[PDB]
Design a binder for this molecule. Sequence first.
Ligand SMILES: *[C@H](O)[C@H](C[C@@H]1CCNC1=O)NC(=O)[C@H](CC(C)C)NC(=O)OCc1ccccc1
Ligand SMILES: *[C@H](O)[C@H](C[C@@H]1CCNC1=O)NC(=O)[C@H](CC(C)C)NC(=O)OCc1ccccc1
Lengths: 306, 306
Amino acid sequence: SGFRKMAFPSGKVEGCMVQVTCGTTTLNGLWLDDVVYCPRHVICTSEDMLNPNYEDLLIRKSNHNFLVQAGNVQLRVIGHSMQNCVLKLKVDTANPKTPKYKFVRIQPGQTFSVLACYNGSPSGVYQCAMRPNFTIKGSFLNGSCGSVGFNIDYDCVSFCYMHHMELPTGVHAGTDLEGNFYGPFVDRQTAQAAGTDTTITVNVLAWLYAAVINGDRWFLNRFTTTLNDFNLVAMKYNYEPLTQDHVDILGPLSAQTGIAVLDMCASLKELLQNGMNGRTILGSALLEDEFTPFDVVRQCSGVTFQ
Amino acid sequence: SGFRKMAFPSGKVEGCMVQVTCGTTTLNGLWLDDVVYCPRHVICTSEDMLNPNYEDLLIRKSNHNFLVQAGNVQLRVIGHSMQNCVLKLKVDTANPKTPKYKFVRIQPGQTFSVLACYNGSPSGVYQCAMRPNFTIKGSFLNGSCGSVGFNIDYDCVSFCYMHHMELPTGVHAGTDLEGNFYGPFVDRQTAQAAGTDTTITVNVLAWLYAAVINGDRWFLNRFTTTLNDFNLVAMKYNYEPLTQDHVDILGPLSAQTGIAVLDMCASLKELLQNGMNGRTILGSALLEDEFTPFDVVRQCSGVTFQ
Ligand SMILES: *[C@H](O)[C@H](C[C@@H]1CCNC1=O)NC(=O)[C@H](CC(C)C)NC(=O)OCc1ccccc1
Ligand SMILES: *[C@H](O)[C@H](C[C@@H]1CCNC1=O)NC(=O)[C@H](CC(C)C)NC(=O)OCc1ccccc1
């Protein structure tokens, strides 16, 4: 038993990270087959980042202006193109460590692992969730751009995130691997407000089920509720509304614990109105929403990968 | 900026995990050079685990009773010996993925990454601390034994933990890689009490420094204190006493933030006596003690590894 914020094993992604240098700027790239993907602001200087015209900046760059390094080996760039906010550098060498991979654009509330890198070398791995306002609460410093977020499905790595920027409020924004930003953000150094950050209700419920599986049952009450009555309370506390699809997704967790979803909603309603009164749940004094129902099943059943 | 519970990249350890089967029992082994390390209770049946005599049980086992599998490849066992609570199986093939490695026995308060495995395949990675009572608060199910804890120092993997058992209270116990248990535990299925779990004060202070580096300064007060006066308050709340060595270790964090260690101790003293009043620090409503001063420097400066 026990419950931890668990990241995916990073071995399959570590072998795909390279260092990309253009002039003075160095960030990380993702080397898959004979293509390196990296944020397009690698072609910017520090003054270009206030109001970059990426088309005009890219005209003055040739293949030989991009230095791609995989540890101590040099990759020769034989072609380059811009796809939305990412650059695709065609190199002369296919990555021999290329895993089975897929590009996926995730939905808010879904979780993934981030392999934080600097100069193309892994620094650490952690788990996070795409917030409802399309930000992530990450840990990134200068030089971390090009670090990727991923999920693993048995033997297939699903890349879903590439890091680009930090907002003035301390949260982080990036793109999918086709270069499309999550949310309304643009890759320029300007004031950009993020919307309201709401709590992922279906994830909180899955975490409460994980608590019951692990022996924390003090929050279970004798009340029940309805979907409409719960959502009326949930909206007041900036919680995401619960839908029938969410109830179906929680179905297997409800069957394993013998606690109906609406009964768990009533327990959550009491926690939202009266607080936790200094108590803790799974070692936390707040309601955690960065575990999906799948994350809970995966950790409480011991799913493994290639 | 930002701060996350960050684990080490697991790639170098994933290539060392194998599956070890003896009769009906299957757990994980660590394959380094031509030696596989695994918990010795792999030779037990379910009834042997109440009161195992490991010497008598091992007499009835030959080399060919141990089935070692690295994915789909079979390793031939050419020798076996018991070193404390671990078995060393000599195999005919040296692991070609053997990294630069070291065996280290860690001290309470130190942190490390756990690669949770089942059937020799990685399931996930998370960060934890050796508690002062020599337990860890992990996430382990049946079949997880032989999973290892590790640190990375540039290119060298330091193995410090191998998982063996879960206590009735839900916490976890294991050995170093020489088979010596952390704490007074023994590998038999019997009631074993753990001591009082105290809070690692030096780790809390490092985490408060990480909060200041990341813009959370509401808890900073105008008071200071002395080491003796702080420890008098710390002992009442089951906090580990702070020593002069701890002050020296926090030195670099104190110099980077311009906040003297004793001034931070006064802020902690106020948090212990008056609580946090519903506020949060780095997104937590409790005082976190699973970040060492080195972990904080490493994450806030972007240290990378091979
Ligand atoms: C890429 O490595 C870097 C990552 C940042 C550095 C601090 N933390 C991060 O996540 N990204 C940038 O420097 C990025 C580049 C633009 C061309 C998009 N800008 C950025 O994040 O600036 C921070 C900021 C911008 C505007 C107002 C306040 C802060
Ligand atoms: C090895 O895979 C396994 C790991 C356990 C299973 C549940 N969570 C874990 O961490 N270890 C054992 O089954 C271990 C074997 C003995 C020979 C040491 N026993 C164990 O942890 O039993 C749990 C327990 C023992 C006594 C009282 C209450 C619970």
